[PDB]
């Protein structure tokens, strides 16, 4: 097997934090309900081609 | 009701006003309201003693509707018949009812309870060496049963096929029968040593269901109702493991049997050697003294013709006296002939497992004398909020059928009318937009369609895999595995075959285009495919269930009638008159009139050994 | 320059198709077809077509008793 290490500096630490924040937003979006489920669509024109 | 002045608005009510009685001073604490006429019970979920009555009410009263705040139960003969079995007498019911009731119990209510609550617990049916004996612990019963016109410590033999007759007769006569098995003192039947492995984790509701059955200490035959995907299989597994005797399992499918066996071994410590599978592929039976047989009812209810390999198996099943029978999906045992396995197969205890205890006919009540009453039931919304099951954003899309198709809908006969509005172009375009939108969201989509022709047309048009009756077991299994772990294949096209009893831990989204008229169970069974999703605990996750129904058609009559059961459980359908962003989609099927006209006609048109060399 | 008293019925294709069958069974119902969303009907039959249509639509609506 191969072992890879990575030393994290101060700039890398803050850089890594933003990557998780973007991932968290994507993770939340993956679970967030669709737009049409968010609001009651009655007044809007009926669905069609 | 004495010297009570009716209100000015009392005329609007018809013999239902219950204001004649007075309220007790301790109303602030008592959570229960009781209807003296209809038997309905309204329970407060936000007041003291609510939890103590939530479980008790289910045992004595069938839950009608259990929304967030105010639960609605109802007392009936069947509901009382289930409660009277588990160590409950009339005095206990009345004493607890009065103690938890803001109002005194009316005489009329008492009279109804007295009649049916004293019947249980006087006649016992036992089985010995495949011979059925109607055993009674008192000699007085002989003067009653033997003198019955229908019929024909003292114990007498009775025909095995006649059990269904006497048991129904027992209901009409004062005393019904109870099927209790004293497996502790039963040494003649061989025992099997199987226990749950340490990795197993019994959920709180599973333990509660078992407690209601073993409360007195003697195993009781009955029915267990749990939400789809809640683990009804494990309920049967626990019963077999705790009894520790010969058991037989019936599963109404072939894919289910394969997955039932795989899960069976995973959760318990039973060795594979002692487990035998009885399906169309293999028919060998275990030669061990004690073992488990997992089959399907169709493989045991057949009478006229059977295979030579199956003929020995049928004798193998009939000859031996089994100890326990598990009727998976027990909503089909009261059907025409699957009940024969219950009679032909000898077992001292019978259990029923079904999420929906309802069917169009009145045969649902036959389960009471077939395997026993209902033991435990579990709420759906309660498990959803506890993380046990996923949340569903149920929706109903009203697609107005195009004018050209609608014209044929009016003139066409009823039989051909179904296919006409199921293949309307609007549904095709809506499905395409939803599929692309949901696929972009990384969601696994399942499209149900009872009509095989529509399934093939949709699948070939969209270039996606489809499964239905003609699909072989090998091919479908490969498709199911691919759809679960393969990222390329994110959606499939299932049919009525996969409506139930197929495990899809990865499925999250569900869509349906066709339906089997007004059945309220198929809607719940189909929804169950996405209720056992693996990622059902991540924050903000909500499953989706879309129902495409043509507006201004008979589908609304069936749609509003085929989703009534789920509404009772707690699911709420959301009407979607508009699907935003549909126009901006690049291409939609049958977007031009030319394609619509072509489809219209296509669907409309649907309705001497030496002479052997000569040939 | 010609005026013709009547009722201008505005509706959708689904209702339009239903009215045609009512007109087919009873000729006097529809006087003239203006457009896919506009029909001219006899004033006398307005009170009957609206009431008669209710029974026909009652079948498509599931009323639990
Ligand atoms: N106690 C449990 N622990 C883990 N998974 C469980 C448990 N109980 C049930 N499951 C899972 O629930 C899913 C559905 O089980 P199944 O018995 O087919 O449900 P039902 O028959 O009620 O539809 C399966 O994935 C099964 O492994
Ligand atoms: F209720 Be399950 F899907 F068998
Ligand atoms: Mg099941």
XYZ file of C-alpha atoms and ligand atoms in Angstrom:
761
model
C 0.000 0.000 0.000
C 0.964 3.655 -0.460
C 0.952 6.303 2.273
C 0.502 9.956 1.300
C 0.863 12.768 3.832
C 0.013 16.455 3.545
C 1.313 19.181 5.859
C -1.262 21.942 6.335
C -0.199 25.559 6.806
C -2.231 28.528 8.022
C -3.301 29.501 4.499
C -4.221 25.891 3.718
C -6.335 25.606 6.878
C -8.534 28.549 5.888
C -8.571 27.282 2.295
C -9.754 23.854 3.457
C -12.490 25.459 5.563
C -14.082 27.082 2.507
C -14.045 23.778 0.599
C -16.168 22.161 3.312
C -18.461 25.200 3.367
C -19.045 24.820 -0.372
C -19.561 21.081 0.125
C -21.981 21.763 2.983
C -23.998 24.108 0.765
C -24.067 21.458 -1.966
C -25.005 18.829 0.622
C -27.834 21.060 1.847
C -28.951 21.631 -1.747
C -28.941 17.879 -2.403
C -31.468 17.577 0.442
C -33.314 20.873 -0.081
C -36.828 20.536 -1.498
C -37.457 21.649 -5.110
C -38.623 25.176 -5.833
C -42.151 24.193 -6.880
C -42.597 22.419 -3.538
C -41.545 25.612 -1.736
C -44.489 27.761 -2.876
C -48.130 26.972 -3.633
C -48.526 27.264 -7.421
C -52.232 27.833 -8.069
C -52.436 31.323 -9.561
C -49.663 30.569 -12.044
C -50.601 29.281 -15.484
C -51.206 25.542 -15.647
C -48.335 23.283 -16.656
C -47.914 22.569 -20.343
C -45.538 22.292 -23.270
C -80.509 12.833 28.787
C -83.025 14.180 31.319
C -84.336 17.746 31.591
C -81.653 19.137 29.273
C -82.775 22.074 27.134
C -81.686 21.644 23.489
C -79.774 24.527 21.965
C -81.211 26.738 19.239
C -78.758 25.101 16.808
C -79.521 21.575 18.056
C -81.799 21.113 15.047
C -78.774 21.028 12.751
C -77.427 18.013 14.656
C -79.304 14.727 14.206
C -79.443 12.453 17.274
C -75.715 13.129 17.782
C -75.695 15.980 20.311
C -73.862 14.790 23.431
C -74.292 17.951 25.513
C -76.876 16.276 27.772
C -74.092 14.811 29.933
C -71.960 16.930 32.258
C -68.184 17.268 32.456
C -66.173 16.072 35.439
C -64.213 18.553 37.588
C -60.910 16.914 36.549
C -61.287 17.661 32.832
C -57.979 19.554 32.849
C -56.133 16.246 33.408
C -58.171 13.547 31.656
C -57.115 13.379 27.974
C -59.929 11.243 26.553
C -63.254 12.154 24.966
C -65.658 9.282 24.263
C -68.537 9.333 21.782
C -71.504 7.525 23.407
C -73.136 6.696 20.041
C -70.503 6.124 17.335
C -67.884 4.794 19.765
C -65.262 7.249 18.511
C -62.597 8.323 21.007
C -60.790 11.662 20.703
C -57.395 11.636 22.427
C -55.412 14.677 23.555
C -51.727 14.317 22.662
C -50.826 17.499 24.600
C -52.343 16.625 28.001
C -51.314 14.324 30.864
C -52.007 10.595 30.497
C -51.824 10.892 26.700
C -49.026 8.337 26.292
C -50.696 5.893 28.691
C -53.791 5.910 26.458
C -52.018 5.998 23.081
C -50.980 2.338 23.342
C -54.087 1.223 25.239
C -56.468 2.839 22.744
C -54.834 1.029 19.817
C -55.385 -2.332 21.520
C -59.072 -1.679 22.254
C -59.885 0.777 19.432
C -58.945 0.722 15.762
C -57.129 3.979 14.864
C -59.125 5.933 12.291
C -56.949 9.050 12.014
C -53.928 10.047 14.116
C -52.800 13.529 13.036
C -50.261 15.671 14.888
C -52.350 16.915 17.820
C -55.746 15.202 18.083
C -55.874 11.433 17.607
C -59.120 9.720 16.592
C -59.857 6.138 17.661
C -63.018 4.043 17.517
C -64.190 1.046 19.543
C -65.677 -1.840 17.557
C -66.351 -5.538 18.038
C -63.168 -6.468 16.169
C -61.090 -3.941 18.121
C -62.488 -5.180 21.438
C -62.002 -8.789 20.326
C -58.295 -8.013 19.925
C -58.003 -6.373 23.354
C -60.039 -8.967 25.268
C -57.473 -11.607 24.282
C -54.403 -10.108 26.005
C -55.372 -10.467 29.656
C -58.142 -7.855 29.612
C -61.610 -8.238 31.127
C -64.697 -6.048 30.908
C -64.120 -4.624 34.392
C -60.588 -3.522 33.493
C -61.763 -1.809 30.297
C -64.630 -0.008 32.034
C -62.526 0.905 35.075
C -59.724 2.330 32.928
C -62.185 3.984 30.537
C -64.048 5.710 33.372
C -60.798 6.694 35.097
C -59.493 8.332 31.901
C -62.861 9.737 30.740
C -63.963 13.317 31.378
C -67.583 12.101 31.277
C -69.363 9.069 32.784
C -69.744 5.998 30.598
C -73.286 5.731 29.264
C -75.377 2.618 29.837
C -75.717 2.034 26.090
C -71.928 1.975 25.691
C -71.621 -0.423 28.634
C -74.210 -2.809 27.186
C -72.287 -3.037 23.908
C -69.020 -3.769 25.730
C -70.570 -6.380 28.034
C -71.918 -8.536 25.213
C -68.674 -9.145 23.317
C -66.044 -8.772 26.067
C -67.072 -11.932 27.980
C -66.855 -14.332 25.021
C -63.092 -14.865 24.808
C -61.388 -17.636 26.742
C -63.490 -20.804 26.963
C -62.575 -23.119 24.033
C -59.089 -24.056 22.802
C -57.985 -25.725 19.562
C -54.888 -27.944 19.660
C -52.944 -29.941 17.071
C -51.188 -33.262 17.678
C -49.493 -35.488 15.088
C -51.256 -33.626 12.262
C -54.583 -34.391 13.984
C -56.737 -31.473 15.133
C -58.396 -31.859 18.544
C -60.917 -29.342 19.904
C -59.798 -29.380 23.534
C -61.790 -27.845 26.388
C -60.687 -27.668 30.023
C -64.264 -28.072 31.327
C -66.791 -30.827 30.675
C -69.771 -28.455 30.431
C -68.873 -27.479 26.855
C -69.676 -30.959 25.522
C -73.416 -30.363 25.922
C -73.077 -27.238 23.736
C -70.595 -27.991 20.939
C -71.696 -31.574 20.260
C -75.371 -30.524 20.161
C -74.716 -27.770 17.604
C -76.539 -28.364 14.328
C -73.561 -27.328 12.192
C -71.071 -29.374 14.224
C -71.212 -33.055 13.310
C -61.107 -31.693 29.938
C -62.873 -33.660 27.212
C -61.172 -33.471 23.811
C -62.591 -34.635 20.478
C -61.157 -34.799 16.975
C -62.221 -32.445 14.186
C -61.570 -32.444 10.451
C -58.658 -30.251 9.390
C -60.633 -28.783 6.484
C -63.544 -28.091 8.858
C -61.531 -25.620 10.966
C -62.585 -22.700 8.762
C -66.237 -23.725 9.230
C -66.305 -24.278 12.997
C -64.214 -21.157 13.611
C -66.691 -19.014 11.676
C -69.505 -20.821 13.493
C -67.689 -20.137 16.768
C -67.994 -16.413 16.028
C -71.764 -16.667 15.545
C -72.182 -18.714 18.736
C -71.361 -17.063 22.058
C -67.868 -18.499 22.549
C -65.080 -17.886 20.008
C -61.886 -19.934 19.943
C -58.348 -18.834 20.794
C -55.170 -20.347 19.330
C -52.611 -20.477 22.151
C -49.459 -22.605 21.894
C -47.623 -23.740 25.038
C -44.268 -24.204 23.335
C -42.544 -24.265 26.737
C -44.180 -27.603 27.613
C -44.158 -28.918 24.015
C -41.243 -31.366 23.865
C -42.516 -33.691 21.119
C -41.840 -31.122 18.399
C -38.096 -30.834 17.653
C -36.424 -27.565 18.611
C -34.053 -25.331 16.647
C -31.307 -23.284 18.325
C -31.246 -19.857 16.655
C -30.603 -16.469 18.255
C -30.108 -12.905 17.062
C -26.472 -11.914 16.626
C -24.957 -9.138 18.774
C -25.025 -6.673 15.864
C -28.836 -6.746 15.977
C -30.611 -3.745 17.518
C -34.281 -4.169 18.430
C -36.072 -0.879 17.837
C -38.434 0.409 20.554
C -41.599 -0.229 18.533
C -40.571 -3.818 17.770
C -40.246 -4.562 21.489
C -43.647 -2.992 22.177
C -45.307 -5.234 19.584
C -43.770 -8.344 21.153
C -44.870 -7.268 24.639
C -48.514 -7.034 23.555
C -48.271 -10.642 22.316
C -46.357 -12.187 25.244
C -47.978 -10.082 27.970
C -49.684 -13.035 29.645
C -46.863 -15.489 28.863
C -48.475 -17.743 26.221
C -47.917 -17.159 22.511
C -51.027 -15.807 20.781
C -51.807 -16.150 17.083
C -52.702 -12.840 15.496
C -51.846 -10.100 13.027
C -49.087 -7.485 13.191
C -49.423 -4.284 11.146
C -46.335 -2.128 10.592
C -45.494 0.624 8.089
C -44.103 -0.456 4.735
C -40.383 -1.032 5.132
C -40.608 -0.836 8.931
C -39.206 -4.369 9.186
C -42.192 -6.703 9.031
C -39.719 -9.394 7.981
C -37.781 -9.056 11.242
C -41.080 -9.336 13.130
C -41.553 -12.799 11.657
C -37.880 -13.590 12.240
C -38.156 -12.733 15.938
C -41.222 -14.947 16.385
C -39.440 -17.934 14.836
C -36.251 -17.310 16.822
C -38.009 -16.999 20.190
C -40.297 -20.003 19.644
C -37.313 -22.205 18.703
C -39.315 -24.814 16.782
C -39.917 -25.939 13.214
C -41.137 -22.979 11.159
C -42.357 -22.369 7.605
C -42.234 -19.026 5.777
C -44.479 -18.008 2.869
C -43.470 -15.013 0.737
C -45.682 -13.931 -2.168
C -42.871 -13.285 -4.647
C -39.660 -14.732 -6.080
C -37.365 -11.705 -5.781
C -38.606 -11.237 -2.216
C -37.769 -14.848 -1.337
C -34.189 -14.330 -2.523
C -33.825 -11.094 -0.546
C -35.758 -12.570 2.393
C -33.224 -15.338 2.711
C -30.268 -12.953 2.405
C -31.635 -10.704 5.152
C -32.668 -13.756 7.175
C -29.081 -14.988 7.457
C -27.653 -11.500 7.998
C -29.763 -10.658 11.053
C -29.901 -14.029 12.860
C -27.281 -16.677 13.613
C -29.045 -19.491 11.738
C -26.571 -21.597 9.789
C -27.124 -21.722 6.002
C -27.293 -25.526 6.177
C -30.538 -25.448 8.180
C -32.123 -22.881 5.819
C -33.867 -24.075 2.651
C -35.369 -22.019 -0.184
C -38.415 -23.262 -2.122
C -38.856 -21.270 -5.343
C -39.226 -22.030 -9.044
C -35.465 -22.381 -9.592
C -34.767 -24.920 -6.820
C -37.252 -27.181 -5.034
C -35.051 -29.299 -2.746
C -36.226 -29.556 0.862
C -34.189 -29.790 4.048
C -33.702 -33.285 5.468
C -32.851 -32.000 8.956
C -35.127 -32.760 11.895
C -35.829 -29.033 12.344
C -35.447 -26.429 9.619
C -36.951 -23.405 7.908
C -38.756 -23.373 4.556
C -39.193 -20.074 2.699
C -41.634 -20.360 -0.202
C -44.566 -18.572 -1.842
C -48.256 -19.302 -1.384
C -48.712 -20.046 -5.092
C -46.132 -22.820 -4.604
C -48.294 -24.431 -1.898
C -51.909 -23.438 -2.688
C -51.968 -25.236 -6.051
C -54.191 -28.325 -5.993
C -54.843 -29.679 -9.494
C -51.368 -30.094 -11.014
C -47.910 -30.078 -9.447
C -44.446 -31.119 -10.547
C -42.845 -34.426 -9.617
C -40.172 -32.522 -7.696
C -42.923 -30.307 -6.264
C -45.227 -33.283 -5.641
C -42.764 -34.706 -3.114
C -42.338 -31.225 -1.629
C -46.103 -30.879 -1.198
C -46.158 -34.219 0.621
C -43.036 -33.111 2.500
C -44.864 -29.991 3.698
C -48.117 -31.803 4.506
C -46.610 -34.855 6.199
C -44.621 -32.937 8.801
C -46.299 -30.974 11.600
C -44.775 -27.498 11.560
C -44.642 -25.322 14.660
C -44.930 -21.818 13.223
C -46.147 -20.300 9.952
C -45.246 -16.769 8.833
C -47.710 -15.291 6.327
C -45.742 -12.463 4.747
C -47.997 -9.846 3.148
C -51.021 -11.253 4.959
C -53.346 -8.949 3.025
C -53.616 -11.705 0.368
C -54.162 -14.738 2.627
C -57.953 -14.096 2.775
C -58.042 -14.308 -1.035
C -59.569 -17.149 -3.039
C -57.158 -19.982 -2.251
C -53.907 -18.908 -0.528
C -55.766 -19.632 2.719
C -55.507 -23.330 1.813
C -51.851 -23.335 2.890
C -52.976 -22.255 6.364
C -55.255 -25.305 6.535
C -53.162 -27.866 4.644
C -49.969 -26.860 6.467
C -50.173 -27.866 10.129
C -48.995 -25.203 12.572
C -49.795 -24.452 16.210
C -49.429 -20.681 15.716
C -50.149 -18.378 12.774
C -48.938 -14.809 12.234
C -49.915 -12.133 9.729
C -47.709 -9.317 8.414
C -49.126 -6.518 6.266
C -48.828 -2.738 6.153
C -52.379 -2.235 4.819
C -55.139 -4.294 6.455
C -57.755 -3.287 3.883
C -59.192 -4.618 0.633
C -62.161 -3.896 -1.606
C -64.227 -6.879 -0.450
C -65.259 -7.787 3.103
C -62.817 -10.716 3.339
C -60.395 -8.550 5.349
C -62.348 -9.438 8.487
C -61.804 -13.127 7.743
C -58.269 -12.740 9.122
C -59.708 -12.655 12.653
C -60.653 -16.349 12.619
C -57.903 -17.360 10.164
C -54.800 -16.374 12.160
C -56.300 -14.275 14.949
C -56.879 -10.615 15.792
C -54.532 -7.670 15.298
C -51.862 -7.433 18.000
C -49.944 -4.178 17.477
C -49.972 -1.188 15.136
C -47.455 1.622 14.672
C -47.918 5.220 13.570
C -46.288 6.517 10.393
C -45.671 10.190 11.196
C -44.303 9.300 14.640
C -41.499 7.251 13.080
C -40.886 9.946 10.454
C -40.066 12.560 13.104
C -37.890 10.081 15.037
C -35.593 9.428 12.062
C -36.713 5.816 11.596
C -38.291 6.577 8.196
C -37.806 9.326 5.640
C -40.139 12.253 5.016
C -42.137 12.364 1.776
C -43.322 15.461 -0.101
C -46.385 13.842 -1.636
C -47.736 15.649 -4.693
C -50.474 15.225 -7.294
C -49.953 16.767 -10.741
C -53.122 17.589 -12.697
C -52.194 17.330 -16.375
C -55.059 18.588 -18.584
C -55.518 16.127 -21.425
C -55.078 17.673 -24.857
C -58.232 18.540 -26.775
C -57.632 16.031 -29.578
C -57.312 13.099 -27.170
C -60.166 14.365 -24.989
C -62.536 14.147 -27.965
C -61.854 10.418 -28.301
C -62.149 10.074 -24.517
C -65.815 11.098 -24.665
C -66.795 8.713 -27.468
C -64.527 5.783 -26.591
C -65.814 2.905 -24.486
C -64.753 2.496 -20.866
C -62.398 -0.435 -21.484
C -60.393 1.442 -24.126
C -60.779 4.774 -22.308
C -58.085 3.880 -19.762
C -55.262 3.626 -22.299
C -56.306 6.888 -23.960
C -55.709 9.273 -21.043
C -52.704 7.350 -19.686
C -50.686 8.097 -22.858
C -51.665 11.752 -23.254
C -48.783 13.902 -24.573
C -48.873 16.249 -21.571
C -47.818 13.443 -19.224
C -44.842 12.625 -21.456
C -43.609 16.225 -21.384
C -44.139 16.614 -17.634
C -42.291 13.364 -16.915
C -39.345 14.369 -19.109
C -38.943 17.735 -17.375
C -39.228 16.199 -13.904
C -36.789 13.398 -14.751
C -34.174 15.828 -16.068
C -34.681 18.204 -13.138
C -34.498 15.402 -10.568
C -31.593 13.696 -12.343
C -29.660 16.968 -12.154
C -30.322 16.793 -8.397
C -28.733 13.343 -8.073
C -31.972 11.553 -7.167
C -32.925 7.963 -7.964
C -36.292 7.899 -9.751
C -38.725 4.980 -10.012
C -41.593 5.157 -12.518
C -44.498 2.789 -11.878
C -46.932 1.830 -14.632
C -49.472 -0.984 -14.413
C -49.971 -0.952 -18.195
C -47.182 -2.945 -19.836
C -47.660 -1.238 -23.207
C -47.235 2.214 -21.663
C -44.158 1.034 -19.755
C -42.478 -0.206 -22.936
C -43.432 2.912 -24.904
C -42.165 5.221 -22.160
C -38.976 3.200 -21.667
C -38.090 2.901 -25.357
C -38.932 6.565 -25.969
C -36.750 7.664 -23.031
C -34.160 4.904 -23.495
C -34.366 3.620 -19.921
C -34.622 0.082 -18.524
C -38.041 -1.355 -17.731
C -39.199 -4.383 -15.737
C -42.577 -6.121 -15.825
C -44.140 -9.579 -15.826
C -42.344 -10.969 -18.872
C -38.951 -9.898 -17.507
C -36.994 -12.940 -16.254
C -35.699 -13.249 -12.713
C -32.043 -13.154 -13.778
C -32.332 -10.042 -15.953
C -34.372 -8.037 -13.439
C -31.976 -8.862 -10.596
C -29.076 -7.520 -12.662
C -31.100 -4.392 -13.464
C -31.967 -3.822 -9.801
C -28.349 -4.201 -8.681
C -27.157 -1.870 -11.445
C -29.753 0.778 -10.571
C -28.644 0.676 -6.922
C -24.868 1.122 -7.256
C -24.336 2.248 -10.875
C -24.182 6.026 -11.259
C -24.896 5.888 -15.000
C -28.321 4.287 -14.442
C -30.134 6.624 -12.042
C -33.736 5.822 -13.039
C -35.732 2.714 -13.934
C -39.275 1.889 -15.089
C -40.947 -0.619 -12.771
C -44.468 -2.015 -13.093
C -47.064 -3.757 -10.935
C -44.560 -6.596 -10.448
C -42.291 -4.414 -8.308
C -45.184 -2.769 -6.492
C -44.197 -4.350 -3.167
C -41.815 -6.652 -1.305
C -38.694 -5.514 -3.212
C -35.976 -3.842 -1.141
C -34.655 -0.588 -2.653
C -32.536 1.072 0.060
C -31.188 3.579 -2.488
C -34.456 4.705 -4.099
C -35.544 8.183 -2.992
C -37.943 9.532 -5.643
C -41.096 7.833 -6.897
C -43.383 8.581 -9.849
C -46.462 6.794 -11.180
C -48.291 7.252 -14.481
C -50.815 4.378 -14.473
C -52.775 2.714 -11.681
C -54.910 -0.312 -10.870
C -58.176 1.614 -10.448
C -59.266 2.412 -6.867
C -57.042 0.172 -4.730
C -55.876 2.001 -1.608
C -53.172 -0.583 -0.823
C -51.219 -0.359 -4.087
C -50.751 3.365 -3.455
C -49.281 2.645 -0.018
C -47.313 -0.375 -1.244
C -45.832 1.621 -4.126
C -44.916 4.477 -1.782
C -43.044 1.983 0.400
C -40.281 1.679 -2.193
C -38.841 5.036 -1.062
C -39.727 4.818 2.648
C -36.695 2.595 3.392
C -34.113 4.935 1.859
C -30.607 4.662 3.289
C -30.074 8.437 3.548
C -33.242 8.994 5.573
C -31.483 10.779 8.464
C -29.387 13.493 6.788
C -30.672 16.967 7.602
C -33.256 18.493 5.285
C -33.865 15.332 3.255
C -37.414 14.907 1.943
C -38.512 12.149 -0.417
C -40.841 12.891 -3.329
C -43.942 11.094 -4.612
C -45.503 12.426 -7.822
C -48.892 11.241 -9.107
C -49.663 12.201 -12.710
C -53.438 12.204 -13.242
C -55.345 13.502 -16.257
C -57.720 16.297 -15.290
C -61.447 16.154 -16.048
C -61.390 12.352 -16.270
C -62.367 9.365 -14.141
C -58.796 9.266 -12.800
C -59.774 11.842 -10.173
C -62.512 9.511 -8.926
C -59.972 6.694 -8.604
C -57.140 9.006 -7.527
C -59.178 10.503 -4.680
C -60.368 6.982 -3.790
C -57.025 5.166 -4.134
C -55.117 7.570 -1.839
C -57.563 7.580 1.092
C -55.517 5.107 3.154
C -52.317 7.164 3.008
C -54.264 10.264 4.064
C -55.393 8.392 7.179
C -51.793 7.450 7.990
C -50.737 11.100 7.805
C -49.430 11.682 4.291
C -50.836 14.772 2.565
C -50.910 15.162 -1.216
C -50.029 18.577 -2.648
C -51.723 19.678 -5.867
C -49.323 21.038 -8.488
C -51.209 22.972 -11.161
C -47.976 24.359 -12.642
C -44.451 22.989 -13.078
C -42.192 26.032 -13.280
C -39.458 26.017 -15.905
C -41.204 23.467 -18.128
C -41.233 25.823 -21.122
C -37.491 26.554 -20.946
C -36.638 22.857 -21.377
C -34.967 22.393 -24.805
C -37.116 19.553 -26.176
C -40.366 17.878 -25.134
C -42.046 14.781 -26.523
C -45.007 15.392 -28.845
C -44.422 19.146 -28.699
C -45.752 19.630 -32.256
C -49.263 18.783 -33.514
C -47.821 16.397 -36.115
C -46.437 14.065 -33.447
C -49.675 14.263 -31.452
C -51.733 13.223 -34.481
C -49.345 10.350 -35.217
C -49.576 9.156 -31.610
C -53.369 9.519 -31.681
C -53.737 7.050 -34.552
C -51.057 4.739 -33.133
C -52.808 4.338 -29.777
C -56.225 4.250 -31.457
C -55.126 1.439 -33.787
C -54.039 -0.629 -30.765
C -57.606 -1.971 -30.554
C -42.941 -43.435 -42.551
C -39.440 -43.196 -41.055
C -37.813 -43.064 -44.497
C -40.136 -40.279 -45.712
C -38.923 -38.005 -42.902
C -36.478 -36.514 -45.415
C -39.425 -34.900 -47.217
C -40.142 -32.631 -44.239
C -73.960 45.621 -38.809
C -75.909 42.818 -37.130
C -76.521 41.958 -33.473
C -77.410 38.518 -32.109
C -78.352 38.220 -28.443
C -76.834 35.258 -26.646
C -74.444 34.024 -23.980
C -70.676 34.054 -24.535
C -69.359 30.947 -22.770
C -65.643 31.084 -21.940
C -64.058 27.804 -20.859
C -61.257 25.315 -21.553
C -61.079 22.556 -24.199
C -62.202 19.942 -21.672
C -65.399 21.853 -20.883
C -65.733 22.807 -24.554
C -65.778 19.144 -25.585
C -68.398 18.354 -22.937
C -70.628 21.183 -24.178
C -70.444 19.813 -27.727
C -71.856 16.455 -26.620
C -74.618 18.290 -24.757
C -75.158 20.284 -27.952
C -75.073 17.052 -29.961
C -77.798 15.566 -27.757
C -79.703 18.888 -27.649
C -79.182 20.925 -30.813
C -80.352 24.260 -29.385
C -77.562 24.398 -26.771
C -74.761 25.881 -28.895
C -75.568 28.641 -31.385
C -72.102 29.198 -32.887
C -68.475 28.284 -32.202
C -66.390 31.453 -31.867
C -62.996 30.016 -30.883
C -61.408 27.165 -28.941
C -62.190 29.088 -25.721
C -65.428 30.848 -26.729
C -68.842 29.399 -27.583
C -72.231 31.020 -28.171
C -75.148 29.254 -26.473
C -78.876 29.835 -26.203
C -79.765 31.932 -23.124
C -82.647 29.627 -22.180
C -80.437 26.529 -21.909
C -77.773 28.253 -19.777
C -79.637 27.393 -16.571
C -79.946 23.758 -17.732
C -76.490 23.073 -19.192
C -74.824 24.315 -16.003
C -77.100 22.163 -13.836
C -77.037 19.164 -16.183
C -73.236 19.260 -16.410
C -73.032 18.909 -12.621
C -74.548 15.417 -12.689
C -72.157 14.311 -15.437
C -69.145 15.587 -13.485
C -70.462 13.999 -10.277
C -69.318 10.615 -11.599
C -65.717 11.835 -11.941
C -65.756 13.096 -8.320
C -65.353 10.568 -5.498
C -67.693 11.612 -2.679
C -67.259 9.392 0.422
C -70.963 9.015 1.217
N -33.832 -3.685 12.818
C -33.400 -3.387 11.595
N -32.111 -3.022 11.404
C -31.717 -2.729 10.158
N -32.419 -2.741 9.027
C -33.693 -3.108 9.252
C -34.247 -3.438 10.473
N -35.588 -3.765 10.324
C -35.813 -3.628 9.042
N -34.707 -3.233 8.332
C -34.632 -2.996 6.896
O -35.879 -2.525 6.452
C -35.976 -2.829 5.033
C -37.342 -3.406 4.745
O -37.522 -4.640 5.486
P -38.779 -5.573 5.132
O -38.877 -6.673 6.136
O -38.732 -5.934 3.685
O -40.019 -4.586 5.374
P -41.597 -4.789 5.098
O -41.810 -6.273 4.902
O -42.300 -4.256 6.322
O -41.920 -3.995 3.859
C -34.772 -3.733 4.708
O -33.733 -2.962 4.117
C -34.327 -4.242 6.082
O -32.972 -4.633 6.140
F -44.539 -3.575 3.442
Be -43.321 -4.256 2.743
F -42.837 -3.446 1.520
F -43.383 -5.774 2.523
Mg -42.250 -7.267 3.221
